[PDB]
Amino acid sequence: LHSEIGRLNNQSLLWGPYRPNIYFGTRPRIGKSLMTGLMWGKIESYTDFQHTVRYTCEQNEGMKGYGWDEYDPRRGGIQSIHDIQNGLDITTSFVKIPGGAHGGSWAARIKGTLNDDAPKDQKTIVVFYVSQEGENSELEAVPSENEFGYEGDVILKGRSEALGNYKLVVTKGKGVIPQSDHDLSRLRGPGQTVVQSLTYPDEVLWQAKPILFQQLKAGIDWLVENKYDVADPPPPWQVYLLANKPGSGNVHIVQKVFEGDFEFDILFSSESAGKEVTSKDLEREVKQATEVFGERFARVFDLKAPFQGDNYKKFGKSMFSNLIGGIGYFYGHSLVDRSYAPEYDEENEGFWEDAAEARARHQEALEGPYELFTSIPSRPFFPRGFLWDEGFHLLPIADWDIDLALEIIKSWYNLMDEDGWIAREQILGAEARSKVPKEFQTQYPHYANPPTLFLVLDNFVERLRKLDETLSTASVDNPEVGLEYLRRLYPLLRRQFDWFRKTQAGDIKSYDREAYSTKEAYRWRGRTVSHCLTSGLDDYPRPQPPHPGELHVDLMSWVGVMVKSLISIGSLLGATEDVEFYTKVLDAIEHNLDDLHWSEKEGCYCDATIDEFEEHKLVCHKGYISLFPFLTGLLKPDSPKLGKLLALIGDESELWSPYGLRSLSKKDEFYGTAENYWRSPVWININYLAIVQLYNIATQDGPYKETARDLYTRLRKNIVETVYRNWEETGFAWEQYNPETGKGQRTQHFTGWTSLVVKIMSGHH
Ligand SMILES: N#Cc1cc(NCc2cccc(CN3C[C@H](O)[C@@H](O)[C@H](O)[C@H]3CO)c2)cc(C2=COCCO2)c1
């Protein structure tokens, strides 16, 4: 039955628009297989199309906005793109039609509407690019009746082991196709849909823009050779129309030119399924998917007061749809330094210089290949897997579709090496690498990241203890299935726990340090004078100078998060010996958080160093770090320390802004200093943790119940309204918010953990 649910989930999630790095494209969850991508651009001149053409996601003054209006990876959805440079409002509807043995069928409609500022007679080039990787697989464009191109549909017939037999149809579409009266029309036709079928080595098929442009350039070269010149030139849109040459190949370029508005369909028909997919099927399955998206949203994200209004419902649907719509499938080699240089042990003073020297050895090499199915922080800026971000992404996704979230967790833990390391940043294949400067590609097996995926597992365990619709919850509805998932994952969780304790260990014993436990002490590896990238809080101020005796209170709290999860999951599997050990470790972290990290002087938790004179010094920078044992759910509801932290959270002169909690106190010496990334701005992921812990205390007998209720009510309101006001004004989710102005700043399209706002609105934790 577990095995049977797994096969149904594989068949359900196989196809998607799983290329979030590009405006629109499809691929299945198979490394070497069939991939599609859309390109478009206005052409007004002989040289402009190279600058107007769109393919990979960006955000600049030329693009108003874009994103999913609705999306469920089992059904598909609808994306809107508002392009100022090309004067076009585009819609891309994608739908999946189950059937057959090869992951079903799918269809897409591309609709382009000129905006009010566009010339009514604008010429727009549209390209559908198709590639297929694999040794024993075939793809062939059926040639047209006509001499120079297609009057009707383009049919590609292909086959592979993975997909069996299939046809992919690009329909004629609706819209004016311009006609050239030039002499050239005798040899190239007056204007029509054309296909070029080509072959390149499999590993470069992803480079769709340069491949297209090499063909356009060959066509212009042919014009120069055959005496078409500036004495009497063809129109630009005809200069940039490829000569029809359909055939067999691993690359197929389908090109159309439209004058004014256009639409056309893509129909992928799996032969092993029922009848072939039609344009009438597409229209029906699109209407049905919207209905089902609507019904599910209302059950799962039931927005509570004061956000019950239709304005907040539209905001919620947009934040949620962009988060789940970033889900990608990535496949390829990773760049990893596997030297394990001893300098990476960071055991001396000045360890950052020694570790620089080791990095300048450049022993990193490509390894894999690996696959990953995951959500991403940002399509235009960060279109790849980040380890602690994915913990935040999956909290709303798990509400939507717990079986989807378990699949993404399973995908992440299948990356873990023998030692228990998962790289914090997954850059899988040349396409993923193309977006990342060579300097920032290399992963280091001594770099951790917060284990925020354990938070999702906690939500699953609580849900466990208490057909697309059926599959989305099969792993909770069928307890046997839930447990077997956990039985299989449990060892890898344990391995990661053991990896943190071997690789991220702090030094109690070699210094004048007294504490309950000799064992429980943690220090993040990887830290430089100005930075600690592995914590997630890049430039949050830490002990200066960095020092092998440092202890980090956030890291100890994350280790607490893991033990608590291992206790729950261990108990469930009856792993008795393990639970006795975890229980003793938890007890020890509870005591040692107080003995090593609590400051009575300052009334909060603090990181620690070793003095010029070799004694334990607390270093207190009031901010997110200061709250960490509260944020990770480690403090008893009656704790006096909790009460002092509630005082710090509520204090306007420290953390509390009208727009949410500040990353750093206005009182701290390092407020608004240097790059100011984590040194003042409001971050929705840490606000989300504070909101959930306040609510926990608010719905429980104890002394701070009513303090918590007031702070919960106001913080939820402030965070939601800040993200909402910015969305209404700009159309974007932002990376962080300015605590003086409330303005979104840094990166747009951050969906991204900013989409936690949908869970904050829906409440009832
Ligand atoms: N100004 C400032 C600023 C800082 C950076 N820093 C490097 C960096 C590298 C990868 C991802 C991230 C995003 N966050 C950083 C979060 O702190 C971390 O916790 C989280 O996991 C990751 C993933 O969401 C930042 C980059 C950029 C810039 C890069 O390329 C496009 C244009 O903007 C601007």
Q: Which is the closest atom of ligand 1 to the Cα of 536?
A: 19
- 151: burial class by Cβ within 10 Å (0-12, 13-18, 19+)? exposed
Tell me which residue of 411, 366, 371 sits closest to 390, measured CA to CA.
411
Cα–Cα distance measured from residue 699 to residue 709, given in angstroms and rounded to the nearest whole number: 8
Q: Which residues pair with 269 in a beta bridge?
A: 167
Distances in Å between the Cα of 327 and the Cα atoms of 54, 228, 253, 323, 534 are: 21, 47, 26, 8, 23
Tell me which residue of 763, 760, 758 sits closest to 313, measured CA to CA.
758
Q: Which two tokens stand for residue 318?
A: 């947009």
Omega within 30 of 0 (cis) for the link into 752: yes
In a domain, 90, yes or no: yes
Phi, psi of 656 (to 5 degrees): -90, 110
Cα–Cα distance measured from residue 106 to residue 100, given in angstroms and rounded to the nearest whole number: 12
Residue type, 623: G
- 742: burial class by Cβ within 10 Å (0-12, 13-18, 19+)? middle
Enumerate residues 6+ apart whose C-beta is below 8 A from 477.
Answer: 470
- Phi and psi based region of residue 391 (left: phi greater than 0; alpha: psi -120 to 50; beta: remaining): alpha
Best residue among 539, 747, 749 to mutate for probing ligand 1, ranked by most atoms within 8 Å of CB: 747
Distances in Å between the Cα of 676 and the Cα atoms of 376, 449, 688, 698, 736 are: 23, 21, 21, 33, 11
Show contacts of 612-616: CB within 8 Å, 24+ apart.
614/511, 614/512, 615/511, 615/512, 616/511, 616/512, 616/513
**206 touches 251 (CB < 8 A):** no
Between the CA of 54 and the centroid of ligand 1 the distance, in Å, is 24
Is ligand 1 within 6 A of the CB of residue 538? yes
Tell me which residue of 663, 653, 709 sits closest to 686, measured CA to CA.
663
Omega within 30 of 0 (cis) for the link into 306: yes
Task: Return the C-alpha torsion angle 640, 646, 651, 656, nearest 10.
Answer: 160
Enumerate residues 6+ apart whose C-beta is below 8 A from 698.
Answer: 705, 708, 709, 712
The CB density around residue 741, as the number of other CB atoms within 10 Å, is 9
3-class secondary structure, 441: coil
Tell me which residue of 7, 297, 253 sits closest to 126, measured CA to CA.
253
3-class secondary structure, 3: helix
Cα–Cα distance measured from residue 167 to residue 688, given in angstroms and rounded to the nearest whole number: 46
In a domain, 420, yes or no: no
3-class secondary structure, 611: coil
CA–centroid distance for 173 within its chain:
33
Q: Which of 538, 594, 602, 651 is catalytic?
A: 538
The CB density around residue 357, as the number of other CB atoms within 10 Å, is 10
Tell me which residue of 277, 312, 315, 252 sits closest to 76, measured CA to CA.
277
Tell me which residue of 64, 70, 29 sits closest to 322, measured CA to CA.
70
Helix, strand and coil content of the chain, in percent to the nearest 5, comes to 40, 25, 40
Residue with tokens 């009438």: 280
Cα–Cα distance measured from residue 233 to residue 230, given in angstroms and rounded to the nearest whole number: 5
Q: Nearest 5°: CA angle at 755, between 453 and 321?
A: 105
CA–centroid distance for 534 within its chain:
18
Q: Breaks in the chain at C–N > 2.5 Å: after which residues?
A: 466
Distances in Å between the Cα of 760 and the Cα atoms of 373, 458, 534 are: 26, 18, 27
Residue 154: in which H helix or E strand, if any?
A: strand 154-160
Residue type, 315: F
Cα–Cα distance measured from residue 142 to residue 149, given in angstroms and rounded to the nearest whole number: 11
Is ligand 1 within 6 A of the CB of residue 338? no
In a domain, 243, yes or no: yes
Residue with tokens 């354990």: 454
Burial 574-589 (b: 16+ CB within 10 A, else e): ebeebbeebeebbebb
Print the domain residue range for 255.
33-274
Task: Return the C-alpha torsion angle 468, 331, 53, 182, nearest 10.
Answer: -90
Q: Which two tokens stand for residue 415?
A: 């990356």
In a domain, 16, yes or no: no
- Could you tell me the sign of the dihedral formed by the alpha carbons of 523, 525, 529, 531, in that order? negative
Cα–Cα distance measured from residue 28 to residue 270, given in angstroms and rounded to the nearest whole number: 13
Residue type, 95: V
Task: Return the C-alpha torsion angle 722, 728, 734, 736, nearest 10.
Answer: -20
**695 touches 712 (CB < 8 A):** yes
Omega within 30 of 0 (cis) for the link into 545: yes
**414 touches 322 (CB < 8 A):** no
Tell me which residue of 643, 653, 613 sits closest to 711, measured CA to CA.
643
Q: Which two tokens stand for residue 207?
A: 């480079």
Distances in Å between the Cα of 336 and the Cα atoms of 339, 440, 544, 745 are: 9, 11, 29, 32
Tell me which residue of 390, 398, 396 sits closest to 536, measured CA to CA.
390
Tell me which residue of 97, 129, 130, 94 sits closest to 111, measured CA to CA.
94
Q: Which residues pair with 174 in a beta bridge?
A: 263
Q: What is the CATH number of the domain that holds 207?
A: 2.70.98.110
Q: How many residues does the chain have?
A: 765
In a domain, 202, yes or no: yes
In a domain, 216, yes or no: yes
Measure CA of the first residue to CA of the last residue in the chain; give whole Å.
31
DSSP-derived letter for residue 540 is -
Is ligand 1 within 6 A of the CB of residue 261? no
Distances in Å between the Cα of 12 and the Cα atoms of 15, 102, 409 are: 8, 10, 17
Best residue among 374, 425, 538 to mutate for probing ligand 1, ranked by most atoms within 8 Å of CB: 538
Q: Which is the closest atom of ligand 1 to the Cα of 753?
A: 24
**621 touches 662 (CB < 8 A):** no
Between the CA of 441 and the centroid of ligand 1 the distance, in Å, is 13
Distances in Å between the Cα of 687 and the Cα atoms of 682, 743, 757 are: 8, 16, 10
3-class secondary structure, 613: coil
Atom 18 of ligand 1 has which residue's CA nearest to it? 536
3-class secondary structure, 196: strand
Phi, psi of 179 (to 5 degrees): -130, 130
Q: Which two tokens stand for residue 241?
A: 């129309």
- Phi and psi based region of residue 100 (left: phi greater than 0; alpha: psi -120 to 50; beta: remaining): left
Annotate 360-428 with DSSP letters as a single string. Answer: TT---EEEEEEEEEE--SBTTTB-SEEHHHHHHHHHHHHHH-HHHHHHHHHHHHTT--TTS---SEE--
- E-assigned strands of 557-674? 598-599, 604-605, 607-610, 616-619, 656-657, 660-661
Tell me which residue of 525, 543, 550, 544 sits closest to 535, measured CA to CA.
525
DSSP-derived letter for residue 601 is T
**163 touches 270 (CB < 8 A):** yes
In a domain, 51, yes or no: yes
Residue with tokens 């419902």: 313
Residue type, 186: R
Cα–Cα distance measured from residue 496 to residue 501, given in angstroms and rounded to the nearest whole number: 9
Phi, psi of 618 (to 5 degrees): -70, 140
**752 touches 733 (CB < 8 A):** yes
**735 touches 727 (CB < 8 A):** no
**140 touches 247 (CB < 8 A):** yes
Q: Is 735 an annotated catalytic residue?
A: yes
Distances in Å between the Cα of 711 and the Cα atoms of 82, 661, 742 are: 39, 11, 19
Helices (H) and strands (E) in the chain, counts: 21, 26
Cα–Cα distance measured from residue 743 to residue 710, given in angstroms and rounded to the nearest whole number: 25
Cα–Cα distance measured from residue 240 to residue 734, given in angstroms and rounded to the nearest whole number: 38
Cα–Cα distance measured from residue 138 to residue 158, given in angstroms and rounded to the nearest whole number: 5
Omega within 30 of 0 (cis) for the link into 369: yes
In a domain, 8, yes or no: no
**84 touches 198 (CB < 8 A):** no
Tell me which residue of 424, 454, 609 sits closest to 523, measured CA to CA.
609
Residue with tokens 């055939």: 247
Tell me which residue of 192, 331, 342 sits closest to 254, measured CA to CA.
192
Between the CA of 676 and the centroid of ligand 1 the distance, in Å, is 12
Phi, psi of 705 (to 5 degrees): -40, -55
CA–centroid distance for 105 within its chain:
25
- 121: burial class by Cβ within 10 Å (0-12, 13-18, 19+)? exposed
Q: Which is the closest atom of ligand 1 to the Cα of 381?
A: 31
Q: How many domains does the chain have?
A: 1
CA–centroid distance for 529 within its chain:
29
Residue type, 126: V
CA–centroid distance for 443 within its chain:
18
Annotate 223-272 with DSSP letters as a single string. Answer: HHHTT--TTSPPPHHHHTSPPPB--B-SEEEEEEEEEEEEEEEEEEEETT
Atom 5 of ligand 1 has which residue's CA nearest to it? 677
- Tell me the chain's radius of gyration from C-alpha atoms: 28
Tell me which residue of 561, 330, 356, 368 sits closest to 448, measured CA to CA.
561
> In angstroms, how far apart are the furthest CA atoms of the chain?
91
Q: β-strand 164-170 against 138-141: which pairing, if any?
A: unpaired
Distances in Å between the Cα of 168 and the Cα atoms of 14, 159, 197, 702 are: 17, 11, 14, 63
